[PDB]
Every structure is written in C-alpha cells, then in structure tokens.
Amino acid sequence: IQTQQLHAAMADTFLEHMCRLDIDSAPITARNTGIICTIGPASRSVETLKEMIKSGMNVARMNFSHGTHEYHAETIKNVRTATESFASDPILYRPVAVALDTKGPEIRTGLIKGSGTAEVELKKGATLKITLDNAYMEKCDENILWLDYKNICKVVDVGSKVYVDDGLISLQVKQKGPDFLVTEVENGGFLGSKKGVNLPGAAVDLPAVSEKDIQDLKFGVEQDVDMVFASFIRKAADVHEVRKILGEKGKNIKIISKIENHEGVRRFDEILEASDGIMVARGDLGIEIPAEKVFLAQKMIIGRCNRAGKPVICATQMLESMIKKPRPTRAEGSDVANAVLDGADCIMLSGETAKGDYPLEAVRMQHLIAREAEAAMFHRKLFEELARASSHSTDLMEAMAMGSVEASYKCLAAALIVLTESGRSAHQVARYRPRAPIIAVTRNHQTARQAHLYRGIFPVVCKDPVQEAWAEDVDLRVNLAMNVGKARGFFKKGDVVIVLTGWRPGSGFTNTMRVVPVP
Amino acid sequence: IQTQQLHAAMADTFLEHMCRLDIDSAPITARNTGIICTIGPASRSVETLKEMIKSGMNVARMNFSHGTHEYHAETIKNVRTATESFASDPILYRPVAVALDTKGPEIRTGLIKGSGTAEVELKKGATLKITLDNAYMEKCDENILWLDYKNICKVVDVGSKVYVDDGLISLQVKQKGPDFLVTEVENGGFLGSKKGVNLPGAAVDLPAVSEKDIQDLKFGVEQDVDMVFASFIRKAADVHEVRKILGEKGKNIKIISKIENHEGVRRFDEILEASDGIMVARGDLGIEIPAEKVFLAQKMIIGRCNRAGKPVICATQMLESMIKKPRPTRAEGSDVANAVLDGADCIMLSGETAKGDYPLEAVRMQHLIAREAEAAMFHRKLFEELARASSHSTDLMEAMAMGSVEASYKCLAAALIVLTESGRSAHQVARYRPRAPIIAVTRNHQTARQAHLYRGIFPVVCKDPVQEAWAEDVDLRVNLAMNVGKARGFFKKGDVVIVLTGWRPGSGFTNTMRVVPVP
Amino acid sequence: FIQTQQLHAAMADTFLEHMCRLDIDSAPITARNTGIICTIGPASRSVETLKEMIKSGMNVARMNFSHGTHEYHAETIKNVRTATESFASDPILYRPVAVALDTKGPEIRTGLITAEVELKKGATLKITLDNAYMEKCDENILWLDYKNICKVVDVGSKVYVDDGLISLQVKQKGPDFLVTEVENGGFLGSKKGVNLPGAAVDLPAVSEKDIQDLKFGVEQDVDMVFASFIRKAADVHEVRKILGEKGKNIKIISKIENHEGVRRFDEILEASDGIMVARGDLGIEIPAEKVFLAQKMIIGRCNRAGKPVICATQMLESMIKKPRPTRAEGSDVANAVLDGADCIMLSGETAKGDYPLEAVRMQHLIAREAEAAMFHRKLFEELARASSHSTDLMEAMAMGSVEASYKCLAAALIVLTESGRSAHQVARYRPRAPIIAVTRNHQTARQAHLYRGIFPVVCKDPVQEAWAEDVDLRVNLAMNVGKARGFFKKGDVVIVLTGWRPGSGFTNTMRVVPVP
Ligand SMILES: [K+]
Ligand SMILES: [K+]
Ligand SMILES: [K+]
Ligand SMILES: [K+]
Ligand SMILES: [K+]
Ligand SMILES: [K+]
Ligand SMILES: [Mg+2]
Ligand SMILES: [Mg+2]
Ligand SMILES: [Mg+2]
C-alpha cells in the first residue's frame, strides 16, 4: 500500500482521485498546516504552554477583546518562557509566533441586575426595550437591556434584526425613536452579562481602529509581536489605518485581516491587496450572513488567497465540542480536514485552548487531521491550476519556485531546503504547494516566527556566526537543515532533497536550485 | 449577479470555480439532497411529524437499537397519518419513506446499580473487571462491568483496547479468564447504563443478522417499509443474508449497507456490488478506525457510489450541537455542505431529531445548507468525470440519461421530467448529476417513496387510470409534472424542460427525449 | 502590439482555442529547433555547394548507400568535412555538421525478361524459384531471388512488384513456386523490387553489402547509421554487432519500413538509439492512406521515450523540378514538426534535384513557424504524465528547468555536458527556447542534432584547473554564441544547467541567469 495517498495522486480525474483515497495509506511525519492556539486561563501557565508546543502549536493568539495589558504581558512572557525552555537543543528548537487579535468595533450588553452570575430568560414573542441610558448599564434584565453602541438608533430601522450572545438570541425592532428601541424576541434564550451584539445588514459606524485598539496596537509593538489579527476589516482603508498605527517601528509586523461581515466579503479583493494575510473569521461571519452561506465565503476566500500566495487562516469552532469532551464530533473532524483540502495555510483554535477542559487533546487532534488531509490533496491538479492563475507573471523567483516544486514532484523529494533572510523565496515555494516540507533556514528570528503563516514552511533558526566565504556559509546552513530533517525523521541518508540557495551573497533571491542526496 | 453559482459554473479550473463562489448568488427553490430523520420521543407525535414534513423530511428512520415492535409500529403509524394528512391537495402532497435501521451485532454494557439512569466515575489508572456472569448484568459499578458479548474472551488478547460509550472511555485488558477480563482504565469518564462497546482490531464473531435482527426484518416486511439500513455490514455475504431474510415478500425493499468498521471499508467494493445503497455510518466508523481518517473513507465511499450510480447517505453528528442549541456550529455547517459537495445523495439526522430540543430547526438547517451546496457543485467537471468513469458501458438508458443531462446543461432547463414505474430511468438520470430537479412521475407508490434515496428526484404519484391510447397516457403524466412543477415553483410558463418518455407501452426504458416549453 | 512566437495561442485553455488563436502576424524567433537532414549527392556534393547548404541550415549530411561506390561516398564525406571546417576559423559561429550512413538493406528482386512484358488483370502468373528461369522471365513465369518466399506467404497473400506498381494474389502454393492472379497489371521490367505486405520476411538484418558498408562507415568515423528495413529488436542488435568496439558510440537509427516493423515497434524502439519513419517504403508496404497513422503513432511513442525520431521522404518532392513547393508539401513539413519530429529529412530534393538550397531554406522557414505553433503547456503536461512512473533525478532537473523556462520566458537553456545526456533529457521535455549544449566532445556535438532544440557548441579551450572557472568559461562561451546568433541579448534571462562538481555525473545545478 503506497504511503501518503500516492496511488490517489496518480489519478486522471478528481473523481478517480477521491475513489482512491485509502485509510491504510500512512501519512508522512511532517505536518504542513500551521496551528494557531488562543491562549487563556486553560493554557497560559508555563507548564501547559510547554505541552502546547510539544503537541504542535505554532502561533499563540492573544485575544484583546478581554484582558488588561498586564494580563497579556504575563501570558506573552509565559509563551516565550515555554518556547525558550527548548533552545537548549538548537536542532530541535521550534520557534513560536505571537499574534495580537484586536477587539475592533464590538457591541456588547451591560451587566444583568443582581450579583454577577445572574441570567434572565428572553421569551419568544415577549418584548424587550434596548436603551442607551448609562443609568441601566448594570441593571439589565428581561425588560430593559443596555448596550454600549450609542449610535445604534441611527443605523437600524423598524424590522431590523438584532442578534445577541453569539447569535443565539434574535430580536426584531418594532418601534424606534432616539435613545431607545422596542424589540420583540423572535428566538429566545437565557441572557447573561456583557454579551456580544450583531446588527446584520446595518451599516455600523464605529471606527475600524478605536482609541482602545490604538493603545493595544502600540502595546503590541512594544511587546515585539509577530502579527496582528485585525477584527472586522471592511475595506482596504481599514487595513491602511492599522498599518499607520503600527508605524515605522512596527512596519515588519504582518497584518492579517479578519473577514467577518458582508461588506468584508464584498470588498474582499481590495482588502487582500492591502493585507499580508487573511483570516476567515467564521464566528461573526456566520451571524452577519446566513450561516448556510459561510462555506461559500470560506472557499472563495481561501482560493483567492492561494491564488495570490498570501496566507489564509480558517478560524472558529473547528473542534468546538472538545471544550467539554476529549474527542471531537464527526462534523468537527470533517471540518478540519476540508479546511486543509480547501487550501488553508493555518487552522485555529479559540475556546478549545483558551478555556476548554482539553486544550492539549484539541491541539493534537488538529495535528493528526491536518497530516491526513495534506496527503489527500490532489497536488498535480492544484499545481497546474495555480500555475494557470499566475501565468501573467514572469517573476524570476516564481519561476525558481515552480521549477523546484515540479522537480520535487518528479523525484518524490523528501523536502525542499530554502535559505532566506526575509523569507520571500520560501513563501514563493509554499505558494505552489509542494507535497514535501519546506525547511527554511534563516538567521532572522522574526522571519522564522512569521513563516508559520505559510503552508509547509518549517522554519529553522541559524545561530552560527557568518562564515568568511559565501560557499561555506551556504553549506553550513544547508547542512543545518539536513541535520534538522534527520532528527525529526523527515528523511534519512540516501533520500533526495531539493535545495534552493543564492549563487552569491548579492543574489536577491534563491536563484540556484539543486537536487541533492541526503548525506 | 447570476443565480445558482452559474458564474462559478463557467470556470475553466477547480480553483477558478472556488474563487467565483458568491454568497450573493441565489440558489434555486428545489433542494435535490434527501433528508433522513431519525424519529424518537422528540419527533414522534403526529403534530410534530407534520411539521417535520413541512420542514423537509423525506425519510423517517426507525432505529431498532431500541424500542419494542409495538413502539415502532405506533411510530410508523404516526408517520403515515402525518404524511397522508396532506393527500387532500394532490399537487402539493409529498411521499415520505419509512426506513428500518437494524440493531446488528452490537455490544452493550449492563445496568449501573440496577438503574437505567445511574452513573459511576471511572478514574484514569483504576482497575475495572469485565464479567459475562449474568448475575452482574444489573449490578455494574466502578469496580465491575458486565457486557453482553458472550465470546469476548475468545476474540481479545492481553493488551487489547476496549472502548465504551461512543468511544469516550477506554480500557486496556491486563488479564483474561474463562468469563471475565481484568482491565485498566486508560481514558476515564462517567459511565452510564447499557452503553455501546467497540473492540477495534478484533475478530468479532457476532452474526451480521442475529435472531433479533431476523425478527425485526420480518416485522419490517409486515409493516411495508421502503428500505433497510443494515448495521455493521462487513462483507457481501452479510448483504446476501439480509436479502435472504427479506425473502420474496420483501424483494422490492432496498438494502442500504452501513459501513462502520475497518473490514467494511476494506471490502467496500464487494459490499457495494451486493447492496442497493450505502450509508457512511461515521459514529461507529470513527471509533473503529482513527477519527482523523474518517473523511478519507467518506470521500472514497461517496465517490465510488457516485461512480456506480448507487445511493449513498452521509450520517451521524452532522448537526450534533443542535441537540441542545437552536443553531449549529460553523464546523457543522461546513460538514453538511461538504457532504453535499462530495456527492452524497442524502444526509441524515439522528439525535438531532430523535431526542433533541430543536428537531424542526435541525431539519430546516439541513434543507438550507443543501440548497446552497448543490448550486456550488462544479457540474461540468463532475459530468465529464462521471462519464469517463463509466465509459466502458454502452447501456442504452445511460446514453439517454447522459444526453438528457447534457441537453439540460446546454439550454439551462428548469427540470427534467421522467416517466417511470420502477424508477430505473429516473435513477440513471440522477446518476449523471443534472443541476435541475428530476420530476419522476410514477403510478407505483413504493417507487415514489424509494426515489428519495437518489439525488434530485422529486417523486410524483399519478393516481389517474391508464389511458387506453399510449400517447394520451404519456401526455396526462407529463402534464401532471408540469402542474406540480408550477405549483411548487420549480418553473413557470415559457421555461424549458427535458422530458424523458417511452415511445411505446412495451419500451423497457425512456428511449424518447424532448425539449419542451412549460405551458 | 501582437505577441511574437504564437504566445497568445500559447495561453489558450483548449486545443481548439489554441488553434483559433494561431496568427500569421505573430513573428517566430530566430532559432530553429528541428534538425534538417540533407541527402548529399550529385546535385549537392561540391565543396562550394556544401558551404551554402550549411549556411542555409543543413545539420546532418546523409549518404545513401543504395547507390555509389565507397570511393564515391568517401569523396562526398571529405567534401562535407572540408566545407564544415571552412567555418572553424571562428569558434563563435562554427556549426557542427554530422555525417550519417543510410544502408541499402536486404532486398528481393526479380530476374530478367532491357525487355518489358505486360501483365493484365485477372491473368495467371507463376512465381518460381527455379534458377533455370532466372534470366527467362516472361508473361507466364517470374523468377525472384528470395528462396524462402513460400515459408512466409499464404494463399490469399499479396506480392507487390516494382515499388507497388504490380500486385499479385497467391492462389496456389507449391513447395518452390506460387501461382498468382495479377490484380494490378502493368508493364514488368527486369530486376525489379518485390514487397510482401504483411509478411514476416526472414531476410537477414544486414546483407553482405551492408556489412561492408557499415565497416566502411566505422572507418569513415560517421556519427550515425540509418538501418534499413528493421523488423525486430534482433535486427538492431545485429547492426550494433557489426559496428563493433570501434563504432560503439555510433548511434543506430532504425528505419520503420513495413508492417512487421510497425507492429513490433515497441521492441525496436527500446533497442534503438532513434527511429526514422521511412514513409516511401512504408507507403509501398502498407496502404498509402494509413501512413499518417504510423507516422503519428511512432512520433508520439518516440517523444514519450525521449528518443530521436526523423520524418523522411517526399516532404518537398516537387522542388526536385520546381523552385517552390506545393501547398501540400508546406503543410506536410509543418505537421511533422507539430507531430513532434526531432528532425526532418530531404532525399532527392537535395541529392539530385535542381533546387537543393531552395529546399533546405524552405524547411528552415516552415519549421520555425511550426515550432512556435506547438501547444507547449499541454505537450509538457502530457509528457510529464506519460513518464511519471520514472523518478529519475536528471528528468526531475530537466522538468524543473523546462518549467522554469516557461514561467519566466527564458531566451534559452544552457547545458554543459560531455555525453550529451543532460541536454537530451531537457530536449525530451520540449522547451520553447533553444538549448545551447556546450561540450568538449566533438562527437556529442555532431550527434546532438538528432534532438529537437539542441544547438551544439564545441568548446576548444583547455580545462581550467579550478572547476568554477571551467564552468564560467563554458557558460560564457554559450552566452557569446547566443548573442552572436541573435538568440538573446544583454538583459534577457537564461536557464543554466551545470554539474556541482567535476564528478556530479549529470547537471544537478540549475540557475536563472541574466544575459551579461
Ligand atoms: K478579538
Ligand atoms: K529570499
Ligand atoms: K441501529
Ligand atoms: K423505467
Ligand atoms: K538506403
Ligand atoms: K551530462
Ligand atoms: Mg469575531
Ligand atoms: Mg453505528
Ligand atoms: Mg526499403
């Protein structure tokens, strides 16, 4: 039985490829899809973060919808402590990236009257007044609900829908006036304190970057984070604002725009152009637009990001049930698998790792599934179609990448080794979706941390001093990658690898491609 | 904005098709994917069943893992009372099929402390003894557990793993005995009464069709059920055994083989050949094989069923969170959509409708997602590859079906109308995956109920007597489909449909095809 | 602006769309990839005419040993080499010219009647092996010299006489005679050729004369042999045997000439260095309306294998007497290039016709246009698919380099190679851009003409002590040749394939390099 779904890889049609998928075809050791974990009370201790890393976490997400700067600074400190506890062994060290996820223009309710834990039942057909009068800030109940969007009355009409608490409760505006709204409960439920509110179809006029966001973004620069997940990006100008706040000192932090509302989907092309990457933020997105349509936005967005070679993250509720249970549902395993087959560069966990009872088991399950799905891609067709979509470009690095991926397919190379300081060369290899892992050797630590955004890039930090001669400095970094591949079981002596280097120190990209036996 | 993802439909590559999927592109009214609902305490009343049918239920599944004949007989009676409550308006009446899901070779534990509702806690590392001594079948506790697989000692070895309660708890055998097994708790949890046991990698020698199964199958014949879902089918001879029990009296009942263990996957080709259809039974499957591999067998099974033209059902945990919540997770939305995109003829609900708090909402959600996903198929490529896979066959009805589908693509027909008594001609059209609905007019009531197994066949029962002139009997039945299509909003006057009919009374299949404007 | 090189058609999605986009106003590139093989004879064998042949595009000089003495052919070869080396003054413009020997091959011939006799349809005719009649052939009795004929023909079989003019049907079989009913009549002369359509002829692979002529080719240091009438792998093995140790590097091109050769093609191809579709004799053996089937089948399977394939015979036939070809002949050349032929050939057009240089020049012009009109992206995909069972390392370099050449529209692929193997593997994957193969082996350079797209460049410089210097020197030589011939100019991009170390064994290093 061929490994790595290689029988299916030889099919002539998508249907035949599907019919050849084999549960007894073992996947390879390397996992190409990056795993992003939201750190929270369930996973922010150093002891647990170490296990998070060993289980496969590549990026730690800090969710600034909650928490003080002091709280997040401590979480970040613990991540770095956990990560550096492994720098003893340079060959086995895994870099770990740090992401800041902005609050953005959120609408929330106030506190339920009584003591903190209270909940009121919103009954179907009952009426409920929404007020903006701060007098009710802390005495919400089933008759009057306060929220913090002072302009809501300007952007909703009679008939508008208001969704509350992750979309579980839906209200219809029956009467307006300024300072308040009268609504009817359509879908009831129990309501607690400080729940999120969505206004689908309304034109919310809160700023993309608020005063709080600016402070959090400045805090992110001071904490040396690697990337920002920008909430509720609606237009390119929103992205430009975030980049301005990060300014000169933060110019190398990647901006990932979260698509989570209708306008974001409508203006997707211009948002992608302006961004370093994209997150399919399915939670809000499935409230803002009909839930049955999210898969359409997900597949469209992943495809266009693959087309452009920009990282795309699939997020939210992938293993939701594992917040309470140690194994996922069948829908959840299928969801992770299909995000990988869709082409997602990374997959994400939120409550599963932030507050769940089984954060490690959830990480491990994403690792297992991603590997199975990675072998099940139809690489030959994917490569042809990606080459087609980019054939207007004659860029020399793209040519080097395509020739290298094509060579790697032909001789079934165990890996592609790429020497890069900005990461650009390795990003262009990943964009053409080789089957084998890309071992990217860099002396630039930020480049290594940010490489987890790209499917298949296994970053390796070189800490050796620069050698006197270029040939020796190149050979030094190539053999580091050989030793890393061996130690992790990506390949053994006598396997074949593709090696991409610069001919001279002044080559501006990896213009040299070799097919090399592993020593 | 073209409707029905028709812009994506005009794409040259899969990637381009993905990039063109548009959440603002309206799907058509008709939903092609059948919906199978498990009936239970939450869905068993006549009044609830009427809403189930209005929400989109096409097949009622009776799960014979539980309940007496008297109980299921009453359920079937209610389903038919509900169904026939709509016969007053023949143009809108919808056939509902009844399916019998066998218990099969299940393994179950006994009663905790004599109680159906009691639970004990199994802690990791504790000892736990499995006995077969019937003295303990109602005296399970945290020290001693009874189960009903008499030969379990024969088929398991020291070291073998044992899974309990939908695989949530795991034990490892440490010592064997004549009628007991001493084990250690590996994955702990709370253990209730009469829970399922799985023995992955064990030569379980239970009959495929037990003495209880034989009773249930003959009860199914008496109750005039339309189909049998056979549990744990391992090989073609298992199907033959089921077909034998159903006998001559039950020869027209479709046998759907449920694939839910490793052997069923390995022997799938012989099982498909012997079965009328297949169910991907993902619950047990993801316990019998590694859960991260289930998507592989799902896609392989659906593809091979599509190839053969035989109905395939995707089942289990598709909308699992809706047992307790009024809207699904994002993984559940994605799971349903991807099953439809894989090619599943039917999707199923189990706990969501048998016992959940939101059975109607679950059915409506499957309906909405299916419609969206059916338009998002890549019909032109699917047709080419289906045709390629079956090109060794020169069957005349396949020729008519492929020509009719091709014609329906070319002129964007609103429907295909197919006159059939056995269903065969309509099934051959369904197999080549038209975009438009297939209105199958038949005078055989059972053929109409069984048509729900096939993607896109909307059955219509003609109750008029056979006209003495063949041409007029054909016209009467085609005009019936015209009126039903108009009343249901599948098309309007001036739309175009493909019409498949027999040239003479003795034609054995629809050898005549016309393009016809709707009057 | 109109894209050159049929690059608009190149971007098409389907073959039909590619066809609909071919553009008479889209100019081809300067470099011509399809080799031209010219038969040298009385019309073309003076040194001064051979100089013009080379200038006009000839890559391979074919000597047809169906006629002429060793002395005659030795002088022709000498004239070819005298003409070739007259350009060796300038190493940047020197073109290698290869020498090919085409064997007479085994034959079946009739006896004597210069008398002529008319056979009439429906008449009876007896074929005898009795030497009594060897010089007494007439209306009723015909002698021929193939003494095993009765072993290989059946009742109902056909016997063709004089390049297919006469056809007979076997009605009765004797132990040493055949009675036949003349189907196609005509006038029958003396010592005429006989063909046995569909027969498994047991004639030797090489005749006595062929053995003498092959040994002569080894003494003359020819680059390749065109072996007539190859019917099975054992025929090719026999030719390699006669070439012996001194000629073990001479390439053997098998000529497919009859039914058995087509039917056993796979085994012949495995055993041969290359293939010639010998359409003249082929169309006498099989029905003329089926030759294109065999031609396309053979070119396809040779392409699949990466072995050279030549399209031969009557391509520009009318130019024997006329200074311009017919439209059927223009089409025929273009379609052979589109089919995938590595080389196209001229026989009488250059050996004896009135317009030998005109024919060479027309083949050159047609090939450049047809080379641009191939559907490279599809061809590459289909060649990749057919060879995907192989994981060979040099194919992977070839495929990645050709792929890189498509993506960045490289002006050329530069390959350093001593055996040529690395360049052959690049040619096999059909880049659009020319392949400049720099070699210090003069025979590799002459033999490279058999492969589509390889422009051989002979390096005459001593080996530099430092490997990096030796590689630079040879890459620069190719840079200089490319600029002088107008294949590229400063600022263009080329793919360069080299060995990492002297012992690398193949070109395991690929670079994208700007033209300096
Ligand atoms: K956030
Ligand atoms: K780089
Ligand atoms: K069951
Ligand atoms: K029928
Ligand atoms: K000859
Ligand atoms: K070589
Ligand atoms: Mg959000
Ligand atoms: Mg089951
Ligand atoms: Mg001949």
Residue numbers in the entry:
A (entry chain B), B (entry chain A): 12 to 530
C (entry chain C): 11 to 123, 128 to 530
From the paper:
With our rM1PYK analysis, we also include three new rM1PYK structures that have not previously been published: the novel liganded states are (i) a 2.4-Å structure of the M1–PYK–Mg2+–Na+ complex, (ii) a 2.3-Å structure of the M1–PYK–Mg2+–pyruvate–K+ complex and (iii) a 2.2-Å structure in which the various subunit active sites are populated by either a phosphonate analogue of PEP or succinate in both the presence and absence of adenosine diphosphate (ADP). Next, we summarize a comparison of 61 subunits from eleven rM1PYK structures, which were determined under a variety of liganded states and solution conditions and can be compared to the H/DX-MS data. Side chains and backbones that showed >3.3 Å shifts were noted; the majority of the observed changes were >10 Å. Our rationale was that the differences among structures reflect the minimal structural ensemble, which in turn gives information about dynamics of this protein structure. The B domain appears to serve as a lid to the catalytic site, which is located on the top surface of a TIM barrel. The B domain is highly flexible and adopts many conformations in the various known crystal structures.
PYK catalyzes the last step in glycolysis and is present in all domains of life. Many PYK isozymes are homotetramers (left); a few PYK isozymes are homodimers. In most isozymes, each monomer comprises three domains (center). The PYK ‘A’ domain is a TIM barrel, the sequence of which is interrupted by the ‘B’ domain.
